[PDB]
Amino acid sequence: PPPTSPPPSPPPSPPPPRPPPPPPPPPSPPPPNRSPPPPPPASSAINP
Amino acid sequence: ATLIPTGLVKGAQAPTPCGMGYFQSSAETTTCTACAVGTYADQAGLAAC
């Protein structure tokens, strides 16, 4: 007699998930303001 | 014409010291000199900076 009909192919395995990425570094801080403003020479007396 | 004086006006009666931020190293001086850069004058009348 002929052999029994083979059974159909079985389903494939489930896939794994993916992790999330870490937070990026903060922006570099700005440098301080460019020098002090020119100072006043000062004047008058301030006397009594 | 008449050998008489006139027009005399008196000078400064008071020492009138050198104001703040202003010094005078030299005596017998009419004006007050500003203190140089880098040095300070804390009180009025300072001989030097």
Coordinates of N, CA and C in Angstrom, one line a residue:
Chain A
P1 N 0.8 -1.2 0.0 CA 0.0 0.0 0.0 C 0.9 1.3 0.0
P2 N 0.3 2.4 -0.5 CA 1.1 3.6 -0.5 C 1.1 4.2 0.9
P3 N 2.2 4.9 1.3 CA 2.3 5.4 2.7 C 1.3 6.6 2.9
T4 N 1.0 6.8 4.2 CA 0.1 7.9 4.5 C 0.7 9.3 4.2
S5 N -0.2 10.2 3.8 CA 0.1 11.5 3.4 C 0.9 12.3 4.5
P6 N 2.0 12.8 4.3 CA 2.8 13.6 5.3 C 2.0 14.8 5.8
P7 N 2.2 15.2 7.0 CA 1.5 16.4 7.6 C 2.1 17.7 7.1
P8 N 1.3 18.8 7.1 CA 1.8 20.1 6.7 C 2.8 20.6 7.6
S9 N 3.5 21.6 7.1 CA 4.6 22.3 7.8 C 4.2 23.0 9.1
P10 N 5.0 23.0 10.2 CA 4.6 23.6 11.4 C 4.9 25.1 11.5
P11 N 4.2 25.8 12.2 CA 4.4 27.3 12.2 C 5.8 27.6 12.8
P12 N 6.3 28.8 12.4 CA 7.6 29.2 12.9 C 7.5 29.8 14.3
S13 N 8.7 29.9 15.0 CA 8.9 30.4 16.3 C 8.6 31.9 16.5
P14 N 8.1 32.4 17.6 CA 7.9 33.8 17.8 C 9.2 34.6 17.9
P15 N 9.2 35.9 17.5 CA 10.4 36.7 17.6 C 10.5 37.4 18.9
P16 N 11.7 37.9 19.3 CA 11.9 38.6 20.5 C 11.8 40.1 20.4
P17 N 11.5 40.8 21.4 CA 11.4 42.3 21.4 C 12.8 43.0 21.4
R18 N 12.7 44.3 21.4 CA 13.9 45.2 21.2 C 13.9 46.2 22.4
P19 N 15.1 46.4 23.0 CA 15.2 47.3 24.1 C 15.1 48.8 23.7
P20 N 14.8 49.7 24.6 CA 14.8 51.1 24.2 C 16.2 51.8 24.4
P21 N 16.5 52.9 23.8 CA 17.8 53.5 23.9 C 17.9 54.4 25.1
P22 N 19.1 54.6 25.7 CA 19.2 55.5 26.8 C 19.2 56.9 26.5
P23 N 18.9 57.8 27.4 CA 18.8 59.3 27.1 C 20.1 59.9 26.7
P24 N 20.1 60.8 25.8 CA 21.3 61.4 25.3 C 21.9 62.4 26.3
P25 N 23.2 62.7 26.2 CA 23.8 63.6 27.1 C 23.3 65.0 26.9
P26 N 23.4 65.9 28.0 CA 22.9 67.2 27.9 C 23.9 68.1 27.1
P27 N 23.4 69.2 26.5 CA 24.2 70.1 25.7 C 25.3 70.7 26.5
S28 N 26.5 71.0 25.9 CA 27.6 71.6 26.6 C 27.3 73.0 27.1
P29 N 27.7 73.4 28.3 CA 27.3 74.6 28.8 C 28.0 75.8 28.1
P30 N 27.3 76.9 28.0 CA 27.9 78.1 27.4 C 29.1 78.7 28.2
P31 N 30.1 79.3 27.5 CA 31.1 79.9 28.3 C 30.6 81.3 28.8
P32 N 31.3 81.8 29.8 CA 30.8 83.0 30.5 C 31.0 84.2 29.5
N33 N 30.3 85.3 29.9 CA 30.3 86.5 29.1 C 31.7 87.1 28.9
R34 N 31.9 87.7 27.7 CA 33.2 88.2 27.3 C 33.6 89.4 28.1
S35 N 34.4 89.1 29.2 CA 35.1 90.1 30.0 C 34.1 91.1 30.7
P36 N 34.6 91.9 31.6 CA 33.7 92.9 32.2 C 33.6 94.1 31.3
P37 N 32.5 94.9 31.4 CA 32.4 96.1 30.7 C 33.5 97.1 31.2
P38 N 33.9 98.1 30.3 CA 34.9 99.1 30.7 C 34.5 99.8 32.0
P39 N 35.4 100.0 33.0 CA 35.0 100.6 34.2 C 35.0 102.1 34.2
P40 N 34.2 102.7 35.0 CA 34.2 104.2 35.1 C 35.4 104.7 35.9
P41 N 36.0 105.8 35.4 CA 37.2 106.3 36.1 C 36.8 107.0 37.4
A42 N 35.6 107.3 37.7 CA 35.1 107.9 38.9 C 35.6 109.4 39.0
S43 N 34.8 110.2 39.7 CA 35.1 111.7 39.7 C 34.5 112.3 41.0
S44 N 34.7 113.6 41.1 CA 34.1 114.6 42.0 C 35.0 114.6 43.3
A45 N 34.4 114.9 44.4 CA 35.1 115.0 45.7 C 34.6 114.0 46.8
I46 N 33.3 114.0 47.0 CA 32.6 113.3 48.1 C 33.1 113.8 49.4
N47 N 33.4 115.1 49.6 CA 33.9 115.6 50.8 C 32.8 116.5 51.5
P48 N 33.2 117.0 52.7 CA 32.3 117.9 53.5 C 32.7 119.3 53.3
Chain B
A1 N 49.0 156.7 40.3 CA 48.4 158.0 40.4 C 48.3 158.5 41.8
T2 N 48.0 157.6 42.7 CA 47.8 158.1 44.1 C 48.5 157.2 45.1
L3 N 49.4 156.2 44.6 CA 50.1 155.3 45.5 C 49.2 154.7 46.5
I4 N 48.1 154.2 46.1 CA 47.1 153.5 47.0 C 46.8 152.1 46.5
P5 N 46.8 151.1 47.3 CA 46.5 149.7 46.8 C 45.0 149.6 46.6
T6 N 44.6 148.6 45.9 CA 43.2 148.3 45.6 C 43.0 146.9 44.9
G7 N 41.8 146.4 45.0 CA 41.5 145.1 44.3 C 42.1 143.9 45.0
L8 N 42.4 143.9 46.3 CA 42.9 142.8 47.0 C 41.7 141.8 47.3
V9 N 41.9 140.5 47.1 CA 40.9 139.5 47.4 C 41.6 138.4 48.1
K10 N 41.1 137.9 49.2 CA 41.8 136.9 50.1 C 41.8 135.6 49.4
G11 N 42.7 134.7 49.8 CA 42.8 133.4 49.2 C 42.0 132.4 50.0
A12 N 42.4 131.1 49.9 CA 41.6 130.0 50.5 C 42.0 130.0 52.0
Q13 N 41.0 130.2 52.9 CA 41.2 130.2 54.3 C 41.4 128.7 54.8
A14 N 40.7 127.8 54.2 CA 40.6 126.4 54.7 C 41.6 125.5 53.9
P15 N 42.0 124.4 54.5 CA 42.9 123.5 53.8 C 42.2 122.8 52.6
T16 N 40.8 122.7 52.7 CA 40.0 122.1 51.6 C 40.6 120.8 51.1
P17 N 40.5 119.7 51.8 CA 41.2 118.5 51.5 C 40.8 117.9 50.2
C18 N 41.7 116.9 49.8 CA 41.5 116.2 48.5 C 40.4 115.2 48.6
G19 N 39.4 115.3 47.8 CA 38.3 114.4 47.8 C 38.7 113.0 47.6
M20 N 37.7 112.1 47.8 CA 37.9 110.6 47.6 C 38.3 110.3 46.2
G21 N 39.1 109.3 46.1 CA 39.6 108.9 44.8 C 40.6 109.9 44.2
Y22 N 41.2 110.7 45.0 CA 42.0 111.8 44.4 C 43.1 112.2 45.5
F23 N 44.3 112.1 45.1 CA 45.4 112.2 46.1 C 46.3 113.4 45.7
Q24 N 47.3 113.7 46.6 CA 48.3 114.7 46.3 C 49.5 114.4 47.1
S25 N 50.5 113.9 46.4 CA 51.8 113.5 47.0 C 52.6 114.7 47.4
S26 N 52.6 115.7 46.5 CA 53.4 116.9 46.6 C 52.7 118.0 47.3
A27 N 53.4 118.7 48.2 CA 52.9 119.8 48.9 C 52.9 121.1 48.1
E28 N 52.3 122.2 48.5 CA 52.2 123.4 47.8 C 51.7 123.3 46.4
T29 N 50.5 122.7 46.3 CA 49.8 122.4 45.1 C 48.4 122.9 45.0
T30 N 48.0 123.4 43.8 CA 46.7 124.0 43.7 C 45.6 123.0 43.3
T31 N 46.0 122.0 42.6 CA 45.0 121.0 42.1 C 45.3 119.6 42.7
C32 N 44.3 118.7 42.6 CA 44.4 117.4 43.2 C 44.5 116.4 42.0
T33 N 45.4 115.4 42.2 CA 45.7 114.4 41.2 C 45.0 113.1 41.4
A34 N 44.5 112.5 40.4 CA 43.8 111.3 40.5 C 44.7 110.1 40.8
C35 N 44.3 109.2 41.7 CA 45.0 108.1 42.0 C 45.2 107.1 40.8
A36 N 46.4 106.6 40.7 CA 46.7 105.8 39.5 C 45.9 104.5 39.5
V37 N 45.9 103.8 38.3 CA 45.3 102.5 38.2 C 45.9 101.5 39.1
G38 N 45.1 100.6 39.7 CA 45.6 99.6 40.5 C 45.6 99.9 42.0
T39 N 45.6 101.2 42.3 CA 45.6 101.7 43.7 C 44.4 102.5 44.0
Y40 N 44.0 102.5 45.3 CA 42.7 103.1 45.7 C 43.0 104.2 46.7
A41 N 42.0 105.1 46.8 CA 42.0 106.2 47.8 C 40.7 106.0 48.7
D42 N 40.9 105.6 49.9 CA 39.7 105.2 50.7 C 39.0 106.4 51.3
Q43 N 39.7 107.4 51.8 CA 39.2 108.5 52.5 C 39.7 109.8 51.9
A44 N 39.0 110.9 52.0 CA 39.4 112.2 51.5 C 40.5 112.7 52.4
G45 N 41.5 113.3 51.7 CA 42.7 113.8 52.4 C 43.9 112.9 52.4
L46 N 43.9 111.8 51.7 CA 45.0 110.9 51.7 C 46.2 111.5 51.1
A47 N 47.3 111.4 51.8 CA 48.6 111.9 51.3 C 49.0 111.3 50.0
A48 N 48.9 109.9 49.9 CA 49.3 109.2 48.8 C 48.2 108.0 48.6
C49 N 48.3 107.3 47.5 CA 47.4 106.3 47.2 C 47.8 105.0 47.9

